[model samples]
Target: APKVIVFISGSCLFGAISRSLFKKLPIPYTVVLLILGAILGVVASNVPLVEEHTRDVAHMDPHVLLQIFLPVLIFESAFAMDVHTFMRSFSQVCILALFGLVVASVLTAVLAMNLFNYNWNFSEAMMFGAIMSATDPVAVVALLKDLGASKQLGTIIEGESLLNDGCAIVIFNVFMKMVFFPQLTSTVGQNVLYFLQVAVAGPLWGYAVAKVTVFFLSHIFNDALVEITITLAATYLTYYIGDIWLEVSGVLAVVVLGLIVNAEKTSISPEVEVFLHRFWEMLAYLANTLIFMMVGVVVTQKALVAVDKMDWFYLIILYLAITIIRGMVISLFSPILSRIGYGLTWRNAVIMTWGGLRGAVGLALALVVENLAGNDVIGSKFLFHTAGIVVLTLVINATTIQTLLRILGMSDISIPKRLAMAGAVRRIHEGQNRTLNMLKSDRFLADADWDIATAACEISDPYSPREFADMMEEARLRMLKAEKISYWKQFEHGMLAREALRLLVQHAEVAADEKDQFILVDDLKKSWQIKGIYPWLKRKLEDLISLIPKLILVVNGKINNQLSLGYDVGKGYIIGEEEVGKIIDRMVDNKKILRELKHISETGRLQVVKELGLLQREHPGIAVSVKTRQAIRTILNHSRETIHELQGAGLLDEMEAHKLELTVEIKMKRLMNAPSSIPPPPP
Candidate 1:
């Protein structure tokens, strides 16, 4: 018992710490625990005092190991897993966990028997195989969850661990019966039938219990604690009936109960959901801690000393046989399954092979065998040694394999992408905030009111001036071509008008005087002309230019605010306001440009009229005496083209580009039909 307690504590501490460390390191938890356990075991063996105390520690009673460790591990794994994923990956998990396990065990037993020169019968060897084949569901589930593994992977592993244990135990029992009563082997057909009875019956019994539990849970009143109790009772009851009464595998029954409970979670209240998640998480942690520590405590000085007398060379060979055979089984079937559309990649196969780390179940079974048949024959001693070896080998191999696999880039894929995108977005936001802070420190704004105004106008467009220019230009030309014109004429006119507006907007901004300072101040007019703005309209253009930036900011602010509001309300009302803002900002800027252009047209400036005529022909929307249906079409068409170009250049995906374009078109159509208050973009 003392030995059991120490081993349990040590194993739990090591397992917990190793799991935490593995999450940060490139190593797998299995490899870390295995190697650590082996190193500790070796150290314990060499240390005289430590070895003596470990050997003297009392062993746990048989009932405790079976009733407690076995069920808790199986139930916890099953409960936590998603049933749908398990069902989808059912075939793959079944093959590896059940059939592959048996094959691995048989191969290992054969190798052990041959290498050790043991006079053990086939049945006896098979018993050892059966013992080793029981996968520890707890280890796999805990490790996978800690690593934040994909749900699909977790389900497959958990499902396999649950089902495979029953198969292994059944095999072990069959062999045990045959060895005790040799006549059982003569009736191989009958024994095979019996195997099916136990295998099939165990699950059926569990399923029936689970369905009943789920049915009752669904109808239960508002008492979450009561519902939770039902869940616990369901798990243990299934295990009890199967193990004691029906004489079937309790492991399978508990697994069935877990599946039932998981399936019922959707019907369960939120209160129940929270309770169970916390409840199961705590239970699993405690159980795993105890099981692993007990494993460590069970290693005795005598067991260590007996290791030399036992066949070390044979043990090594058996270990290699188990590892290789398990790998072969997984590799051989994985591709075949993948071809059938199962997505069972060779990479997963290799991973599963490395992940099959034998743990407490193997040791417990060995102890069961020892209790049944004392250490008279070399077989009993070999069983103990093999169990020890498995624990050591698996701890080393699983941890190392998981580490290497992670380093080789086979852990979760989506997490890294999400983290990277999140980090990039965070950096961009931080830089923007820093720039705003500097502006604030320099007294760029007079107060919070000025800051809000600047944020709404100049500082918060969330886009560059160039992008705004592109959007407005596209909208202008789209409105032009919607009016009746020959396709070729429309194309040529559209191009000419786009260039004229670009110049007109620049000129108006540059020519405005300092008193009415805009892009149209006298000194700026020359700058505007050099940059292609018309000199005559520079003053008016400058006046409108200041407002354009502010208008753009208002639109952006509206959109951002709408997004936040929609998120908060969980409704779609904000989308309409966001779309309206974009259209209004473009309209206001265009109205200013067109007013200046009309002045140029009316003034007896034939040169300006000629340019304006080209602009009218190219951009019919700008010539719209009154904004009409055709005008809206032209704007929308131009916006669509701009979006297409942006998308083609890979600046944005087709979906996002199309969405923005569509929003602009819809808003333009709505505004043309019935002009309403131009809503600023939500802040």
Candidate 2:
């Protein structure tokens, strides 16, 4: 109806205005949206269509609201999370998330019951505590991303927030049960068991579903809509099955599902994966926009009228209580966090405590409380205080986290990173200047305002580097990443085998991760040496079994590609490493390092050729297999070009040309599999 149009149109309109209005502001756009929504709620009666939309959203069911937005936020963020970085701090993340949630919940409950004047029962206080327990990383994580702060710090905060959100909801559900059914009393041990049941079962269910989803995803090829539909269905199914049927944490199930799907991205087509990311991001953005604005509108409409002056005082007290509780919990666990993973620093711990921003999750839980308790005094207080905390954190903690990071020196870019930026900018300027000169020479562009174009393209000052040691290592890492991408491209283009691509990627990654151990030529050569028991046993079996003839056929299949590909791969790196070394040497004027790098490349090339030499010397028939492989490759290339040329000349149609190409490829592969006669090598 028109009411529906008003609500959706109002949300989109506000979203556009919020993004445009605060595009350059330090405060997040979400904060601006919330404030705007609150402002709209205040003046909705006077504003034409605003009140209608506000009224519609205000009457929306809290359960439906939670379901609509919670998965959007959880699944999108969890799917995009860098699993490798997350696992690096897995232990610390778990400790902080699980223990920190419990500590904050218990402490906040104690403070509310005893330290504050809120005369509430144990269940009431605990429910409020659990409601406030979740931390929203949206504001803080966005700030961290924008500032280019410490990645490990961001990972820990993001990972902890993600995990604690699920755990906090679990606690909230448990206490909600106790609050509703007073007759159903349980001991602490039983409570713990129930908590563990849901927590553990959710991930298991998620993993099973993810495996089946990915299996089907892998079977499907290049259908973005269908693949995304399946993913969306799986996400909600995970939520419904775990939350309702299995009585486990649906939020956690979705989280696990997202993560598992993320890790199995190789199973999904690249096009579909790209679409999936964009789709989820858009959905999450819409959900966030609507949820925050709706929360603001609802709170302003109800809580403002219901809350008294004394209730406002209590809200402030509750905000302060939770803030200190968060700090204390983090402080107590700082020592343990310091000794693990990337090793958390005092500054990072401080940021973690201060950057704990409460948002929609807590607000959603408070809505549940309101629904459950109806018109109870305690429920009204919970709604008021939860909204107040969310707003206060956004207004106070979120707004000032950047300043805190700067004060703690955690926001400063590293010297190597700055150097890279400066170098990149200078190179870009050089390229841009050439393009500008070419454009100026054009007759049509000669009269254009070149000065304005230049000014428009200008970037600010670049920082100077004080050291080259770290820059050198950074360059090495950059080259390794480039090498890995090249291998991936080869696989995509069908020019490399999957196993070969995996090996190449592993080689580059190992060298990049442990520069000292794998950076040297000798170490790399040693790494390539076959020392495993499987290979040793296979060689022994070949020698004793007189399997040369059978091995020749097998070798024709694998060793043919392996030997020739190895040669090209080695030559590829030699050229790549030398080019990179020369470029870096040009920048730093370090010939010694340039020579060291060339030596490494040469040593690798020599080792690869030496392996080929050993194969030929040990089994002379392999040379014939190599010759057959070369012949097959040459024939295939010529046939491909001839087919394309004929197709271009109107001698063959599109389908006919494709079918001919496929036929030629199949026959060539069959030729490689079984050659009629072993061809002798050239003299």
Candidate 3:
């Protein structure tokens, strides 16, 4: 048990590192794990006691992977599926899944027979066809999660993977029985009939299980814990009942049940939904970590036995054939999907083809063939090639996907955003300077108060967005303080009443929050504790004492250029807006918003003054609730409408009508969706 704990812990730790490593690489985490496994495969086989030490992988039977990990991964993928996105691309997903399977299968089958010149029966070839046709849901989901913004492309690839997993499995079974027993099911028609039976049986039993669960849960229980327990049990129970008891496609059963239950998921309290999602996400993570790492080990052991006989070139050949066929199939259906209103642009279609990664499901199918058939020559041979193809797709295709997107201009370059942020940083410092001048003019502020306020608002690292936002929040706090001081003067005099002063106090508390949740090296030197004459004297004394190091450092600095620098001026120097004048000039040229915000401190105080009821007789509409503003606008708009009728008769043109209508148009929708739908990108 100790060794077991160590082994699992070690694999997870490696998996975690691989995630960080491949995160910047184009490939998914699974492929990096495979590389680790393969390297270990090469080393561990020759290492002493290694196989025996890792034999705890003994329980990681292929069938165990299939029954345990496969269902959990599939169910999670289905449950978390964006059903809105799925339905939008429904036609494309169906064709790419079902039609794409036929293309991949036929392509592999034909290529296997003709290109390889291997003697192959049709049924045996189709078995290869079916297995290879199944794409990994884990691979697609992980890949797309890493790369966002191709919603249509991601939806199709992932949606197809879930459906395609079941389709390929059922299809594999159809050909498998005919190839082996040649009695259970027969020719094309019976094959079709048998195929439909498993496929239909899967969803039927799955849907029935889901319908029953939903019916029972909605009636007998609303308990979140119970609800969670039931789904967890049902995920496996439905699979077992179908695969073991009823002799149907249990994998499909789990998937269908997942999608069904996901619909009912919204009915649960958000608490249960959170629990379920977090639970499944962790389960999927563990499952993928083990499977990806273990697969390389599995492959190595298989190679040790007889897989060396696998035609090495077949790996290269099959990969090319499948890819060409995948792209061709997607191309054919992409336009068809487009015509039906689920169009994927040709570039997106190409990305979809390139990004589809094959893994566990295909490997699972191939391994089971060898298991069920014992040493049957053809099954063993097919297993090798299938495994080779899985390795190629996981390793090669997954790695280059980021590059492919870049080549096609589909990937996020982010130079624009980075530059914008740089410009923003420059403007923040500029605004801080203007804010200083404004605050210095304040009649009530003492020099000490101004000093601390200016220090807090200063931009230490102009390159950091978080630093900029933090300073803005600090600026707001300063505004709150100044507003209080300004108003409290009125309170100290007879100008303001106690109730209004109390209201002013209440409003100041809310000003500390970031106005619009917006995004560094950090701030100044760590501590100012050692900053006086003794600190300077102690530093010079230390330089003189160690002396030899100081002389060498000064020499090195001289070798580069003429310099009088010491350790203080090395890499430890933080990037900063130290040149205040230079930053302000840059802000004037490029950062209008910074200047606007600086002025907003003054204008915003007037807005806040009204909110605190300091303005009793008449108040500005801009400072009121959106509801009150709407009521005032409603009356103004009615007046504008009558004027607009006369203008429309002949007078309405590009005049004050433009500005007035524009203001109203902008405000028109603010009553309802003030924060509005589909938040726009930052300008």
Candidate 4:
């Protein structure tokens, strides 16, 4: 019992530290976590007393990974896919998955058997390729999101990674059969039939399972506990049944189940649908944390102890060879893609080629290779080779992707000016809140032994989150106006190209007058809102589901109180006056922006024109854009008088009235800054 506790505690400790480092780390957090496991395994294995217990923890089967980890890792990523986007690129996904894998496989094999003398038959080589060539975009996708990669680029890379699993698994099955039973030789026709058997059956199995269960869930969806069981039945039962009993690919079966569930989810109750995603998301997240760390432990231990294992030289060769071949396959497809209007530019090909990092999927597949080899010494070598490549890829490709993005100039940072400013405002307010929390500590009062610290620790907070957001928007608008004027000066002076000038002008204009769109938001309670369970069954379930949220609140309340107690006892007490005084001092700085906005509002167009006369030396090139020209020509187009009248008559709410006023001021400023300083006449 103590040993078990130790193992659990150690695992949690490592996992916690790694996760906490996620936002702070230069490399991906998972990689760091995996490395932590590797370090632990290495330490535990060689160290005294610890190895006796840790050995069992470090050693787990490849099939276990395939069974448990694969589902979580793949499902959540694939489930997020939009049906429409997937369809638009459906053909492209297929070609990349099918054609790319085949080419990557052949090339991977040639390098393994020829240069490295892996000494496998064509079938063995192919099996190795099938696994190695299978892409896992876990690292790639995360990086893209971090850097705000373009929708098209991230989607293609990510979607192809998903769509190809079925193909690769099917390919591996064929090759694994051929490699294990050399007597089993087949014509192209037989190969196609076997492939089709699993390929066709896998998705059909998913749909059938989904149709039946979704109908079942719609009725019994009230109880979260019962809902979890039903989905589990759907997730694994569907997988095991099709993959084990029916002799098809479980990976594809699971993917199909996920896809079908995502598509047909409306059949379930609305609240239940949220749980469906949340349950799987939570499961997937846990599985991700567990698997990467274990892979580290397993791979490192295997590399050190396994005698017949592959060398680092061949591993590096394999890495380079895979890259060469992947680029080749991409090159082969690029022209065809361009013709089909899904082309990669030279730059994209470079990024995709270098950015292709193998992930947990590769490690799982490699372990599967060792298992299929089944007690053979070569199995050790195979695993070692696989683990090495995966590690190297993370270190080599994933490690340097940010630098690659920087050199390529491909970051797609699209946070809008308003949102960007709001976020900045939120960040500062959050900082002050944190500083205030620090001030409330007893250390502030009691740490006189450390005099400088106590004196400096006094802090305060004045602004509400909403107020901070408003203040930020006000300053941001002033900054944006200045930025536009500067850009306009460049265009006027012919220092900037017209092409460059248009986009700059557009960016400035977007900030100058961010015409907010109508966002249709309704309560989760009202929107697709599911409130009840089935009429016929599960009163027991009703007891469970209805009671759980109350339980959550109870537990959460206790946790918060405990945390607050910890914080209070851990630090010095607050001097309440200093806190409020500091807050007042901090917030008074907002007057700088509030003062500017206030004066601008109170004053007429005359002083603004005089100040902008600085830019008049170069023509403001200001024509009231046809876009905002409507705010004038239409007259009712949300102008200043328009907002004031609406507010006076109680047609606009306080929030809505202020919003309209800001947008109105932007429009007038644009027109007034125009070269003519007059509204453009309508045609």
Candidate 5:
């Protein structure tokens, strides 16, 4: 057995290296090694020297297998899982892996025993069921990791396997006791109490150990090697305490401990994470290879020959029954459970059921049964046969069903983005509305003032004072440049007409208002006359509309309510004042320049012309001045060329031109010297 262990370890290392290099190959090292071991087992069975050695060795040595390999594999898988995501799906995982699985397996076992008429008692049948229900955490974890399943699904599968093994063991024990002492009362209440105690105790012990370990690791965190040692010791200690002191499921305790430690790994130093990840990867590889290979190595070729003849058909039926019952349990409960918010959707249930592949755990339990119940051939053989069937079915069905379901778009179980976005929008709207109501109730302004301001800021309306002012300034600038008309002006004018048309369509509302007798049709026609202004007005109106919602949101106290309507209104008013000021400023400057050019032209003053030329040279960057001077010079030169034509057409009357020049000088003086002015509101 010792030599066998060494040989298996060597084979596993080789397999791991081979698998890593040729990752594109679908075959896992477990499958590859199992085949190799089976061939080796067959060959060894035929060799007289191997048969002689096997005859002397104990068939079920505890130290050689269970303690050495099983715990290592279980702990490694559990430690690698994400604890947070596992807790999120804890309820569904529990139901499917624990209660649902137990029921399914028992039902299958009962039907199989009866169909075969194998003369097995209910206790024996139950023992078979319990053993069969223990899924191989190692195999399933490896497969899921390989296939790139979602982290949540991987957590659920690993978490369930870690816990389910304990439940299965307990179930098997209860039945074994019943078989041994038929007269002893099967206290259902006691059993339930025991189940709760062990389940609760396992996780509590695990958490305590994990927290303590994490605390020490955080403080002592210098050496990666030391940290790895601490982690390994903690894992083993958790199992020992659960098994020896509490007399509970050590496997589950270790799993819980691993999960807690993994979850809190971030709190530890980065050195620890790197060490733990590498260590676990190596340990899991070693344990998995040896454990799977042992499954083949332990097979009794001669015993199987006789059992195969008698029970091959029974095994097939039992396998089908287990698979069908498991699927039925998942399908029946998943939809109902999901609706109640337990996270067990039909898709998840289907994937979980299909993915429930029994491996090393089932095999280990069978070995336990064979070792503990020494003359109970009926129970041992049933368990052994059931374990074999489970392994075969899991490998075959999981390989096919899991792949097919993923391909058919049934496996990915992530939450949709559309649902998340809808949730965000609803929250934002709610927050905004709350702010608005707060402002309204507080009486921030006089009733009439509030009403008028609120109406102006209404989200459905097109008027925004600030945006409008900005647009007006834009138009004035364009006019100064003599540029072609902008598309923006057209859009703005169109929107104004559209708003007026909407108001006209609401004639009843307009008529109902006593303060204003502006009928919709009259407003519409007035707006229609200014339709050319649509392009420039549209962007401003749209900007105003968008701001209204934000303002309403703030006023309702749903969001930041510090924003003041007075501040916003003042901002709009200031912008309007600024635009008018800029227009007046430009007009005054242009008028002054025109006056100087006119006086120079009439007096024929070279000094004035030189002064104008110096002004142009000094302020060359001023586009308005440069362009205006060019225009004036062109008009003067044309006047000199067509003096006779001008006189005949009466287009350039000397008195009128002189009056225009004098008027320009007076306007320029008033504009350049006057204080800034604001545009008055429309009548």
Candidate 6:
């Protein structure tokens, strides 16, 4: 146990240090971790004292990595992804992930067969192809965002990475069965059918599991710990049940589970959703941190076994072949992508081709292959070549991707945003000069070196006039951002349900993409209309209970619960309108900007308010109950906050404060689960 502790501490210690070292460096942080981990492995092997305690770190079980780490990493990415944006780019991403992967894998395999002079059979070559097909560009996505590329570009790349990882694993497994289990071997059509069976079956399991999970989750209230635990369990259980029991693709199962959970995120308590997101994020971080370091350690340790001149030659050729193959795949797909989702440009296509990096997933798959094959000749070649490709891509491709983006002109900020910055900088210079004049009249600063201060603060301006359309678009996006923030704050305060916040936020995002840049009442109305399988089932069931009084009581309860969600969303929409109006009032100085913003906000506000009035009048009891619930939650939350302040100031003991907070929380939970509908008064 102590040695294990020492091992984790040492790796994490290096992991933390790596972050500080790579802040301004062009290389990705994972690349640095890989290098540092290799260094640690070197230190461990040579120094006897270090070797005694840290041997386990250098000998990670390849079989264990699939069960332990892959699910966490996949879930985090899928869950954190913006499902709305992903759907918009779904076709393009699917083409790249599915079609592009098969092309790349087949090409890589053929090249391997032709170059290696038939040392390996067709199955072995293809296994190597599938193993290398998974792209794990964990750092490249961050680099894209850091370099200010288009959000759609990032989404397409990210979505493609997510799907292709699962697809590659499925392909690898099919080829593995052929290589090892001869009975599973069949014709080309049979193989493709089996591939589709496993891949499609996995998501069915995910959907069923997600449906059941959401049913239970919606009944729970306000406990992030319990809710998060349930999700954690669901992640692993979906993988095990699908992959182990059903003999399907667990990676895809887990991927779909996360995506479904994201879609049904409103089923969880609104208050705890933020906490759950952060929890998974941290879980992914730790998984990523450990996986890279462990791989580095193991790869370095295994280097002594292969040590062949011919393998190095093959590795070099394989890297060049895969790079060229990726470029060809993207160029081939570019025409199809051009008709889909905002259209892909030549530069983005080039970036996409170059940025297809292989990381821990490929390494993990290689290790799995190595363990299963047990032959040093074929398996070690695969492992060595996969690692070499990963290293070459990270060192060569990832490191220079930023420069490539710059050359392609993808990294430049939009002209309007750039002009806005220039204006802001010019104003800052003017403000500094005004401050200097004020400082000269001050007695305290009368002896201050005014010349030095003025010179030091002087800033050159490249200010330029902004076009009206550009100015309007920028203002519209900023207001939409403000409205998005408002929806979140309202959710945290219990004025909005989780569903309401999602709708409002989605509306804002969609509105930002519109040419008019105004939130339309009809668009928001559609967003709030409950439309999903779960809701449809509930409505159908409600109709069936019409004749039975006992069932009718239960049915009304369910209806009220849903009604409460809609009312909360309606209230939030009204609040957003007011909030956006105030933001426009404060944000823009130009009268024209103000006039147009008010016109947009007020027009939408009046429509929403008038529509909500009809619903409130029709369902007065549920409306009143929802309104009362919101205020009760706000008061309870504030009470807990006060108790926390008292505890911090030493006016109360920690235990006492905790007990008080729990009591208040318990009360809040009771209210949360209470009937949302009040019986219509004395008919």
Best model number under lDDT: 6
Residue 598's lDDT in candidate 2:
57
lDDT of 6 by residue, 466-560 (tens): 58778778777887878888889777765776556767776777888787656677776754354445446545766775545545555555656
User: Judged by lDDT against the true structure, how good is candidate 1?
Assistant: 0.57
Worst 10 residues of 6 by lDDT: 526-535
Candidate 5: where is the Cα deviation over 4 Å?
1-5, 13-27, 48-60, 137-151, 173-197, 302-305, 342-345, 410-683
For candidate 2, write residues 361-456 as lDDT tens digits. Answer: 887888777766765666667777887788777878765786787787766777656877888888888889899878878868687887778999
lDDT of 1 at 546: 56
Ranking by TM-score: 6, 2, 4, 3, 1, 5
Q: Please give the lDDT score at residue 287 for candidate 1.
A: 67
Judged by lDDT relative to the true structure, which candidate is superior, 1 or 2?
Answer: 2
lDDT of 2: 0.73
lDDT of each residue in 1-683, candidate 5, tens digit only = 36555565556675776578546654445555666656666766899665543443325474356666656777777777666567657776777677776776678567757776567767777777787777764555555665533445667778777777756766765576567556866488987887788768867877778778876765652346777788888877777677768856666677767777776664455556777777887877776666665555555442244365457777776777777877887777776567644466666676777777777667666666666665656634654574467557655865676576667574444342344446766676667567667666765442545556555653431111988656544434333222111212322333212222222223323343333232222332232131233323533555777675444432332111111111122222223223333344444445653454334223433333343455334323332332443344455445544654665688888886656554443443333222211222365
Clashing pairs in 4: 219-534, 441-572, 441-573, 442-571, 442-572, 442-573, 443-572
How would you encode candidate 1's per-residue C-alpha lDDT over 1-683 as one tens digit per residue? Answer: 35655665666778778878777664445545655654665666788656655455324465556776667667776777766567657777776676677776777678657766667877787787787666664554555665543445666767777777667766776676667556633477876687787878878888888878876875665357888898887777777778778767677778777877776664576567888878887777666555444344444322444556446666666677777877787777676666654566666566566667666667666655655564455435645565556666656765676675677565545543455556767776688777766767865453556555546643222211988766654443332222112222333434223222333333332332122222222321221122222322433544667565555444433333322222211111122122333344444456665555334323423433344355335423222422243355567768777888898888998788867965774465344333212232454
Clashing pairs in 3: 338-343, 647-652
Ranking by lDDT: 6, 2, 3, 4, 1, 5
Runs of candidate 6 exceeding 4 Å displacement: 1-10, 36-61, 82-95, 147-149, 183-197, 208-242, 261-290, 297-313, 335-342, 408-410, 413-517, 522-525, 529-603, 610-657, 667-683
lDDT of 4: 0.61
User: Could you tell me every candidate's TM-score relative to the true structure?
Assistant: 0.56, 0.73, 0.59, 0.60, 0.55, 0.74
lDDT of 6 at 303: 49
